[PDB]
């Protein structure tokens, strides 16, 4: 030990604010709290990691395993130092040696990596990194492409059975077996998180509360250690363990000694949590989870779940669902919105207090247009949530759908309510023209549900005609909600099937582009993970929208509606 500090272990309640003050003024409290924890601990000898026959086995000499808790390999007689591998056993909130902090194997080390997985009887590998970063290699690829099917590393034969590529991580299902040994194949689970930058942090803390949700779910048929590794086996990896461990700690004592725990970590493995940001990440991780909890229902249980989520027993009280919706932290004046509020540009907003955040408004190649970028399930795919153009922007509207190369447009409104215009009419029967571009409606197909108009677009630079589809859902007043939902869904079938997957292809609008457009965007995203995972986190999906535009799902009616349709369209 040395002289660090004595930080008071945060209790649930005060966590939210403790956090708030701890971060104030570029979070210098945190900075020091973190700057006090030593890189390494000089007492714990490190004499094996430094031997010569073992120096090619490391990736960076900056990070070396302590001698006392270093993971050892079966000594292969003859081969000098054939017991060393860069990896350290890590203790959890309780379970001692719950994890194994491993440095990403080197090509010169792949074999020794799979040997450690066989010997320690691990059945869960948590890879938090990418093999390549900055045209610099961070981790050798130690597994068979789904295509080569099987590959043996030394005596360890690894056969892949599944490769499920999700938005942030890819989950593989491997089967290993030692072949110079009658023992039988074991079921290995390998998650790879790809939305986590070396030396840095992910886009949102929920992404971490996410893979933690996933790993704590996998089978560990052998009570073996959990292999967590990145490039050096200290940064992102140690950070992960931070969240995981400290989250058990919360669910148990309702307090968390992050500072303490990280020290315990820098005591088991050199410079674990390596960044003030990663340090703060663990906290936000905790704050966020404690704050909103776990809101991700699986398709298996969606129906039963919701039902009770709706029952609000003492009727004198709200429902569990309502509870949730009320937890949804609307991001009021969340970020800068100056642009949309400039003099001349104030007359370009159908709805005054529905201005895109300066942080994502759509640049009008700048120039001002009241539409903003909305995140898509598959990142980085993106949608454009705009408002019904104004007869005084009917032009700019088209210039946007061109520059941004919009393929399909979705109109959720009518053209007006008797007198009151709910939208302009950016399209005519003729060959309408606006600025450097001219539209030309080619087909107008109406159905009892929605009506589809095919446009052909061009600018004086002819022989480029870009066909643009517009779908117009009628059945949906800013009063009621989708009258016949089942068809609002089909509306989405055709829409998604007219978009070419993985280049902004889509654009969705309505009066203000938040009112109904919110429910739409929310559905597209929930429908996607609903297909690619069978898991649905309506809360977070909505929490993201609110974070992008003032307006999305603002009423419980709408909120509860997401649950209804997601549920009813999956018995």
């Amino acid at each position: 030990e040395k002289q660090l500090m004595n930080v008071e272990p945060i209790h649930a309640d005060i966590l939210l604010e403790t956090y708030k003050r701890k971060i104030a003024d570029e979070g210098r409290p945190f900075l020091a709290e973190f700057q006090s924890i030593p890189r390494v601990f000089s007492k714990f000898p490190i004499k094996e990691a430094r031997k010569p026959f073992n120096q090619n086995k490391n990736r960076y000499v900056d990070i070396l395993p302590y001698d006392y808790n270093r993971v050892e390999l079966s000594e292969i007689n003859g081969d000098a130092g054939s017991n060393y591998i860069n990896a350290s056993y890590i203790d959890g909130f309780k379970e001692p040696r719950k994890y194994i902090a491993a440095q990403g194997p080197r090509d010169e080390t792949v074999d020794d990596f799979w040997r450690m997985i066989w010997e320690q009887k691990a059945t869960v590998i948590v890879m938090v990194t990418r093999c390549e970063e900055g045209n610099r290699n961070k981790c050798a690829e130690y597994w068979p492409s789904m295509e080569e099917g099987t590959r043996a590393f030394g005596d360890v034969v690894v056969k892949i059975n599944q490769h499920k590529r999700c938005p942030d991580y890819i989950i593989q299902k491997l089967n290993i077996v030692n072949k110079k040994e009658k023992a039988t194949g074991r079921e290995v689970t390998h998650i790879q998180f790809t939305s986590w930058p070396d030396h840095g942090v992910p886009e949102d803390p929920h992404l971490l509360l996410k893979l933690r949700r996933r790993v704590n779910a996998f089978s560990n048929f052998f009570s073996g250690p959990i292999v967590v590794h990145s490039s050096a086996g200290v940064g992102r990896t140690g950070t992960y363990i931070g969240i995981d461990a400290m989250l058990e700690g919360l669910e148990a004592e309702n307090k968390v000694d992050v500072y303490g725990y990280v020290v315990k970590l820098r005591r088991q493995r050199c410079l674990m949590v390596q960044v003030e940001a990663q340090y703060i990440l663990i906290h936000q991780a905790l704050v966020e989870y404690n704050q909103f909890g776990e809101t991700e229902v699986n398709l298996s249980e969606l129906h039963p779940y919701l039902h009770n989520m709706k029952k609000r027993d003492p009727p004198s009280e709200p429902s569990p669902l309502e509870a949730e919706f009320q937890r949804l932290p609307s991001y009021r004046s969340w970020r800068t919105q100056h642009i949309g509020n400039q003099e001349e540009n104030k007359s370009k907003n159908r709805n005054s207090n529905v201005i895109p955040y300066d942080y994502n408004r759509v640049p009008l190649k700048s120039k001002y247009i009241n539409a903003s970028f909305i995140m898509s399930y598959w990142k980085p795919e993106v949608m454009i949530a705009a408002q019904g153009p104004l007869k005084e922007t009917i032009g700019d509207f088209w210039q946007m759908i061109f520059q941004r190369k919009v393929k399909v447009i979705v109109m959720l409104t009518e053209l007006k309510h008797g007198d009151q215009e709910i939208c302009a009419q950016y399209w005519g029967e003729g060959k309408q023209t606006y600025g450097d571009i001219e539209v030309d409606l080619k087909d107008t197909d109406k159905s009892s549900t929605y009506t589809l108009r095919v446009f052909e677009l061009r600018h004086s630079k002819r022989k480029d005609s870009r066909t643009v589809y517009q779908y117009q859902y009628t059945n949906w007043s800013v009063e009621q909600l989708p009258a016949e939902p089942k068809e609002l869904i089909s509306m989405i079938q055709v829409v998604k099937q007219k978009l070419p997957q993985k280049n902004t292809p889509l654009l969705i609008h309505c009066r203000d582009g938040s009112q109904q457009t919110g429910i739409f965007c929310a559905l597209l995203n929930l429908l996607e993970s609903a297909e690619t995972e069978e898991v649905v986190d309506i809360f977070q999906v909505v929490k993201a929208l609110r974070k992008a535009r003032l307006g999305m799902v603002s009423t419980f009616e709408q909120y509860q509606f997401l649950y209804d349709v997601i549920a009813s369209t999956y018995p």
């Binding site: 960076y60 900056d62 030396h199 200290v234």
Partner: peptide
């Protein structure tokens, strides 16, 4: 090499 070096991790920093």
């Amino acid at each position: 090499p070096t991790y920093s």
